[PDB]
Every structure is written in C-alpha cells, then in structure tokens.
Amino acid sequence: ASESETLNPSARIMTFYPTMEEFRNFSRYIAYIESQGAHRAGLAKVVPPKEWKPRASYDDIDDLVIPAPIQQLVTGQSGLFTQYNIQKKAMTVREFRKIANSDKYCTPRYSEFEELERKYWKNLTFNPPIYGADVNGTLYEKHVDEWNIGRLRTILDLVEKESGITIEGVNTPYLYFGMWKTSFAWHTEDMDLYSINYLHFGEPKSWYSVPPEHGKRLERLAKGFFPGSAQSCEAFLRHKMTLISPLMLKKYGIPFDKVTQEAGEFMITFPYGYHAGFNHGFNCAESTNFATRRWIEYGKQAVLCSCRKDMVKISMDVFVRKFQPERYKLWKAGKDNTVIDHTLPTP
C-alpha cells in the first residue's frame, strides 16, 4: 500500500460536490476525484453546484422523436437473467411519457428504495417495459461550457481529430428516456473507456458497480452461469444482455456497491468498472464516453467482442504513439507486457 491503495481502501462509491471553480475544468476535476481514490469503486457521483444548469426547461421536447425505442423482454430466474431488446416503431416523447405514466407501466408504490429494489428484481421478467435508449442528440444549450457532454474536450477527441471517424454514443452524445423497470445490463464501456451520465429530469436511476480491481471475478462468475454465451464470445457481457441480481453477487463473494442517481446529478464510470442498473420511472439521461491518459493502458488491453460486426473498435495506435512513444515500437511488436494497477492514479 503506497497511499494509492491507501485511498478509498474499501473501494466504495464516493460522491463529490465541486464548487463552480472546481467544476469549471472537467478533465482536472476527474484527475482530482481519482486522487481521492474515486476510481477504485468504478463509479462515482458528482453533484454540480446548485446554480449550474445545462438547459432552461424541458417543456419543449414532447415533440422529440425516439427513432428506435425497444421493449425489454427478460427471461431468467434465481437472480440470473438475459434481456432481449425488441425494436418498436418510432415515437415521440409525448407518446412515450404517456405509456410510461400509464397505470400499466407506472412505478409501483413503495416506502424505501430497498423495497423498490426488491420489486424490481421480483418483477423484471413481467410486463416488459419500453426504453427509448441510445438516441442521438443533446439537451445541453450551446452556451454551457461546463461539463458539456457534447464537448468534454478529453484526449478521446484524438480519434475524431486524427481520422474524422465518429462513433455515435462514444464520441457523440446519447439520450435515454426510461420508465419503471427499464434497465441496463452488466458491462464496462466500449474499449473500457470512462462514461459520463447526467440525469436531466424525472425519477431516479439506481446503479450497481463492481470495483475494477475485481472485474475479472465478475467475468468468471458470468462465464460460469452462461457457459454457452461465454464460448461463443469471450466478451459476451459486451452484448449488454446479462442481468445478475445483487443477491447473486453477494452469494458468490463478488464485491459491489449500489447508488441511486437523482435528477440533476452526474454519474461517472471508470475504465473496466462493471456496472448495471434500472430506472425508477419516467426520466431522461444523457451520456457519452470520454478518455484520460490513465485509460490508454486499459484501451490497449480491452477484451473485445468479435462475434458481432458493428461493435465499437478504436485503434490505440494514435494514443500509444502520442503518449507512450518509448513503448510504441515494443507494443507494435506485441511485446508490451505492462500490468495495470487499478488503484494507481496518474502521477
């Protein structure tokens, strides 16, 4: 333990409340929370200063179109499930909100989150909800320069910069319109990048996270529960179809933490941090991926899915050449055997 492993030793989800001054520089603040060990949990919450807002009001989006909403059919039992996303016909937020608030797909009543959580894991395979996920677009106003998911200005911009290649949702923003019981399966980001998520408005979004330090253990458990999927694609979790309840993680000794995101709050996932969750009710979130110098090693060692052809793939060549010149030759010759230290920040 060299102060690196001494910071956030429990590797739990930390929450930060930056001042408008600290909040101003995105990349700087990220390096700051990592200095406090936030990356150890694989997920961190950041509450923006109360006087900050990305948009005046959202009373003008009932017209926004959700080109490919999906109905989430889930099959499984005893805390292990597989989610099949069926594409539905395009619809407007108005139509979505209508259904979301209907008593058919409405959020059930409950006292404490614990109860809402139990209801989620108890009925996720019933009454398949609709999720207006992965919608190209932003809700930020052109003038917002602080934490603008549309232009974070991280080194991830080097992909577009160097090749002009655009990867929707990765180096471009996505909007997610959810309803009660809509969920996102266990996964790390594409190329094990970082992700940023802002809940514009609506009901909460709860998250589960596994410390990057224990990610391989989660994979081994997953492989064992879905042997078939594992042999057809080592990185089958990237298909984003696998759901595992916290009781199952608990039963097999896989450390994890949970947190609930409220409207107006940001969530940050770190490289190789597995996460999953579900929406409490009607809500809208925006997110994209971003990179840091620390991500580079992760990107070089990311295990990718090949069984599918349309998966996100990023050439690490431009990053190794620019930030690891002394190792470019070695890496290009597949002799770079660097070992990643998940607790180490970026000295």
Binding site: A68, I70, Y84, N85, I86, Q87, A133, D134, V159, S163, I165, I167, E168, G169, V170, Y174, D190, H239, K240, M241, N289, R308, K309, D310, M311, V312, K313, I314, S315, D317
Partner: peptide, 17 residues
C-alpha cells in the same frame, strides 16, 4: 482483416418482432 480498426455504434443489439 474483415472489419475497420476504428468504428461502430454504442447502441447494442436490436432484435425485431
């Protein structure tokens, strides 16, 4: 090869009825 070294979409699988 058989695919680009850089590209793709974040939107996961999409099955249709």
């Amino acid at each position: 090869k058989s695919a680009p070294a850089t590209g793709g979409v974040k939107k996961p699988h999409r099955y249709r009825p």
